[PDB]
Amino acid sequence: GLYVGGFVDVVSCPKLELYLDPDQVTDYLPVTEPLPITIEHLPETEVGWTLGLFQVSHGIFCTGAITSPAFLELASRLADTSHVARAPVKNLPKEPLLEILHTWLPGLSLSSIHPRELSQTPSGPVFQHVSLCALGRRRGTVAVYGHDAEWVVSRFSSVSKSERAHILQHVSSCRLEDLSTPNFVSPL
């Protein structure tokens, strides 16, 4: 069980593309229904689920859980045994897993439909998934990975106490065990 949090970039047709202003989608927030957490908008890389997308003072904040056993075990092995994975991280970190995810997947990209379908009334869901990304971070903040949801939200000074309380209310109400098993498979 691993938690992630941070401010997101809102992209439409990712890697195909248009970055959106957070205000173009605030009318459709919050989103407390689980959305899949994938990697670089790739299919079959679901590693977890969103626990809440909230509009706060300085943009759209995301809190999610990384639940894929295959991904956690693979990432943990690389963090403990790979000189390449540890090259861009400070020497001898206490939590090599967290620091490596923090360094290699800093971006949280929120997938969305085209804006031309938002000015009108959208027919279907506006958001498709959130992605951990190695590139493309603009307005978003570097994703924070940790073991306690409260600890993750604490690392962001851009979130007031009242906001933080609103987040943990919807995060604490979600049990990670009731979530579906992500479909991630190791591409090794």
Q: Active-site residues: which are they?
A: 41, 109, 129
Is 124 or 187 the residue whose CB approaches ligand 8N4 more closely?
Answer: 187
The interface region with ligand 8N4, picked from 2-10, 59-67, 99-107, 161-169 by CB under 6 A, is 99-107
Query: CB of 175: closest distance to ligand 8N4 in angstroms?
Result: 26
Say how many residues make up the chain.
Answer: 188
Angle at alpha carbon of residue 42, lines to 38 and 44, rounded to 5°: 70
Told to check if 118 binds ligand 8N4 by CB under 6 A, we report no
130 near ligand 8N4, rule: CB under 6 A: no
User: Are residues 62 and 132 in contact, defined by beta-carbon separation less than 8 angstroms?
Assistant: no
Q: Does 39 bind ligand 8N4 (CB under 6 A)?
A: yes
Residues 142-171, interacting with ligand 8N4 (CB under 6 A): none
* Contact partners, residue 188, CB within 8 Å, separation at least 6: 74
Residue 88: Cβ within 10 Å count: 10
72 contributes a contact to ligand 8N4 by CB under 6 A: no
Determine which helix (DSSP H) or strand (DSSP E) holds 175, and give its type and residue range. Answer: none
Question: Which residue matches tokens 């609103």?
Answer: 166
Binding site for ligand 8N4 (CB under 6 A): 39, 45, 71, 74-75, 78, 85, 100, 104-105, 134, 186-187
